[PDB]
Design a protein around this ligand. Sequence first.
Ligand SMILES: [Zn+2]
Ligand SMILES: [Zn+2]
Ligand SMILES: [Zn+2]
Ligand SMILES: [Zn+2]
Lengths: 196, 56, 89, 129, 61, 226, 37, 157
Amino acid sequence: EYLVPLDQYLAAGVHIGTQQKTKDMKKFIYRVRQDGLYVLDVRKTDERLKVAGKFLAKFEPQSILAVSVRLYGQKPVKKFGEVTGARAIPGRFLPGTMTNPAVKNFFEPDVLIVTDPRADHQAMREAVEIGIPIVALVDTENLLSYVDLAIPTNNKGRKALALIYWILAREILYNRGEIQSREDFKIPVEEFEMKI
Amino acid sequence: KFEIPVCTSCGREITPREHATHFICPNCGEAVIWRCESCRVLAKPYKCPNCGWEGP
Amino acid sequence: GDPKRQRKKYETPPHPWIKERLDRERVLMDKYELKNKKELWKHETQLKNFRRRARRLLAARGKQAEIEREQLLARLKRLGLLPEDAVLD
Amino acid sequence: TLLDPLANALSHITNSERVGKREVYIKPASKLIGEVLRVMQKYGYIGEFEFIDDGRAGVYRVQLLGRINKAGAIKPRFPVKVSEFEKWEKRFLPAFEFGILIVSTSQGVMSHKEAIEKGIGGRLIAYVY
Amino acid sequence: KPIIPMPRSRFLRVKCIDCGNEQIVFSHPATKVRCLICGATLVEPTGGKGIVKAKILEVLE
Amino acid sequence: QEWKEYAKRVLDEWEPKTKLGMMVKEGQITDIHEIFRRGYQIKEPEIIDVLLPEVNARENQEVLDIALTVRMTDSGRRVRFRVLAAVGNRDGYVGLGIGHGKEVGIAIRKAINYAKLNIIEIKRGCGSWECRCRRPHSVPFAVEGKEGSVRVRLIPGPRGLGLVIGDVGKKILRLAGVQDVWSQTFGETRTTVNFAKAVFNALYNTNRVAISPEMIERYGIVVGRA
Amino acid sequence: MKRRPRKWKKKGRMRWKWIKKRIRRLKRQRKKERGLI
Amino acid sequence: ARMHARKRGKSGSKRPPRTAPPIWVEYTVEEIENLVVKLRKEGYSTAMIGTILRDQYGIPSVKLFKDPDNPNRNLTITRILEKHGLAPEIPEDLMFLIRRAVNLRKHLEQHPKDLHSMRGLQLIESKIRRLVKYYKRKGKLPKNWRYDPETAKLLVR
RNA sequence: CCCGGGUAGUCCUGGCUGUAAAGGAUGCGGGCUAGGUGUCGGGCGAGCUUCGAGCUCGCCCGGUGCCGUAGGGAAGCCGUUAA
RNA sequence: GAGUGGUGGCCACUAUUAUUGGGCCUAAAGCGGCCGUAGCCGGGCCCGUAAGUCCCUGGCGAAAUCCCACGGCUCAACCGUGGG
Ligand SMILES: [Zn+2]
Ligand SMILES: [Zn+2]
Ligand SMILES: [Zn+2]
Ligand SMILES: [Zn+2]
């Protein structure tokens, strides 16, 4: 049925969004609360997570690049890259990484994942310039411009980001066949979380 | 003579040096989805011809 | 209201001093031992008139257009500038 | 105020095609608009179109296929004979036989190619290429 | 915006409280609607939807 | 096959640095048409040197404009050279570039390199009323382009009629492989950079016109190599 | 007087208000000389 | 937009697409005509008659009913009044505009310095002249009919 | 230019003059072309309430601002209040 | 090249006269603002007339001049016979 139970999803607070809205994310928005806050759809989040896992299982694991400027997402992308073999960039993204061959850390991935389209604007711009598929963790106020695969989630909460990246890594491993089943994943969820 | 790629959403041809993209369908894995620069900027949804899966 | 005035049968280049045209024309005059530039310009005008007639008749429909097309082809073949099996193209 | 429903429809179609829309609504509708849409559908520039009743002049729902570079009405509606079509083709089209000049003729609304085939003239009302 | 505008107002089959007479009234009246039998008021006109002062038996189209 | 020998030399004595260069080196891409319409970025001139070696020919390289720009400082005037150049084989492919330098030779070299990086692919044919043939001697249909204040409209012309355009347009179209054309220009054509970029934009925009399958046969449309 | 806002710019010319005043004085003087008052 | 203010207000009626009267209408054509006649005798205009019919009697519109005496026409308040010999002598909108122009002139002769109200009066007279032109063309007014403020007082009275 | 005084004028009534950087330096009517975010008026729905013509949130229409996509322009910039 | 310079005039250049086909925020240029007369431009459907419009067919719009084919002055300019 669902990859993760409703209680765990709500505890991580994936459905919690931002007071602002967007016509692009109107299709993912569930409802608006009495205080003006918008709630996402956990069912659509789960479906898009399954789709993203299946999509990312096909790429070569060294050619996937996951980026997160946001501090709450810096640790989850590092853990996801360690688990799945993909390259991870937390913190500041050096301009010219994907467009300047003279840069010492020059690298051209086959697929990009961004924790936040607004925060990781430089990485998205360079990915657009080089012409590669883009997967974006999108919130209620985000725009789906230049986003080839959108995952509706709370891309600001620490627990939400950790759970989303843990689910994505587990699904990628399952679909790639490294783990024979979902239950074979023996990495705790708290490992992805950033420690305060 | 060689085949010229055609956008999946709008059905127009792809110019030589535009910021277009192409990828295997995330759902079925059989068909290939092409998106032109204008469709990518405007976030126009696309449907896979095989599964019928819709959206970016 | 003016009577007819006889006109020149050749045309003068739009610019008298262009390097590429000057070299091409000089090569032609040296090759064919012509006496003056207006001789080459007369031959060029004849060629341009043939081309203009062909272009005008290509996009024309009618019995007179057909007659003119056949007459142009016959005249060119008689002059010997085209093979006996040539077409309007 | 509203003066040219056909020109409004063609401008709306052109704008939607440029912005990448797949479906358009034409309002108000008219039989001339229906004939023009029939000609474009026959020549393959638009997909399916349907008439909807709303207690008014009506609405036309049209599906676009991304095959139109430019569609526009011709005003004033110049009368044209059989032998005068070449200059209008040069005026309104990029190359010979590229687009279609929609002409209202005494035998109905048809493209300039069919008008030439039938050997009749008319009034230029639109152009699509 | 919609390609076929449709009214937001409805007609109401309403029973008068005082005498029980059944009537059909508009939900957005510009006048003071009164019962045809006893004259008691039924709907209060306002700037928008009226205030119904009698039992609404049914909402028609 | 001197250009083939040059291409082979560029192939062996070269270490690729980008994904497209790696594809060319390992032979995944073998034709020039395969590096277009895919969103790839071109940052290595060796890719063009291998796939389309004719661009290095002296007759295939053209220097369009040389300008002397001046910047004011405390000491005096600092002189820079801006060179606008174009390259490409005279069949299907053309490219334009601008290079800045302290010396004219450096500026020319940089402009040639940037033109090779900016090479594009066009479409040719015949759409004139007075020709109606099916040879790729002209533009298949009327096209438009603009850069700055210059607007250029290219119209198909009959075979045997020279390029009726300014000198810069003549050079660009000759490098692109077009032989006959009519032109209509508006704006300041004396601005060489803007005029050249408008002509280049029109040649690129020839790819933006939607066509039917029968139009290819009607106009003899040839994409890239003929 | 007709409006010429191009003349209000002060680059290499005196104020248009005072030019207008001088022109009006000249016109009145000419009318007085001609006797039209 | 508006005729003079050039504003783009869009408030108005939104009638659903209909071809036949609704089935829940209790009254018939004869009773509807009798009610229209009774309201006209009471002294309401056509707009007020229609509003009362919609509000109190629950009749969505008289125009939904086919004319019994003319198969090519639908029913109408003015048509019912004219077949019962109760139609207004001059069009109601023209009468209303003339009435309020006369009232405004009466106010302005006591307040000569109200230039804004004077402009409003000028706009009202322009509307009156537009309507007079239209009705002269359509033959609803005599060809010699003209609008004059002095003679408009008798028409208002 | 600064300071101390000061006539016409600035104020009311009946008139004349018809001029301003009278500027949004942008004539007016109609159709279409991503959004996001304040505020004013009206309407609708929901939740609070001291039951207020009160407060909060969402939607529709009409005004009034800023940022901005496609696109436009020589550029400054305009961008459903289009340039 | 037996011609080649100089001056005045007309067209192109010039989309600097813009129907095709120009502009008016900051460069020349939106009346200070509204009402409105002639003119110009005008919502959807049904029937009737062919004035505009399109097609066909008779009488015309002299010749010379313009284009094409052939024929005669050596070819040509020129002239004649036919088609336009
Ligand atoms: Zn597309
Ligand atoms: Zn699929
Ligand atoms: Zn009662
Ligand atoms: Zn040709």
